Amino acid sequence: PALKPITLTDHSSADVIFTPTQIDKNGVAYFRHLQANGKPIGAYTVSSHVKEPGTNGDVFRVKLFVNVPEVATEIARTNRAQVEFILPAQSAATVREDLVALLASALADTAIKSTIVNVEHFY
């Protein structure tokens, strides 16, 4: 996946174009979606970094961050989503594919989505 701008749909299904911002010192890839006025403090961000195993480690650590700030009219507070997948090296790609599919379907399920959107506990 060569670094390239990616389009994501918001709650209204409207397209939202994140352009690539930065490749980190550690390997983190930062995509930014600026606001209308081009205010950095208001820009959405998406981070993607994958950590390979070392010293005969079985695990892969792949991280995806989605940060949505809201500006307060000067200082802004940020809602964040932070996902870490832990993937063993022997697992065939079938497993990782349906694991992702499971996560996305859990986000789509109304009961689970209520947990995040309405900050309600399970009871």
* Footprint (CB under 8 A) of its own copies, residues 53-72: 56, 58, 60, 62, 64, 66, 68, 70-72
What are the CA-CA distances from residue 62 to residues 19, 53, 75, 83 (Å)? 21, 11, 31, 8
Give, as ranges, the residues between 100 and 119 that touch its own copies (CB under 8 A): 100-119
Options 17, 54, 55, 96; binder of its own copies; rule CB under 8 A? 96
Instruction: Sketch the per residue contact string, 14 through 53, with its own copies: x for CB under 8 A, - otherwise.
Output: --x--xxxxx-xxx-xx-x-x--xxxxx--x-x-xxx-x-
What are the CA-CA distances from residue 34 to residues 19, 46, 76, 118 (Å)? 9, 12, 14, 27
Using CB under 8 A, count the residues that bind its own copies: 97
> If DSSP codes are grouped into helix, strand and coil, which group holds residue 100?
helix
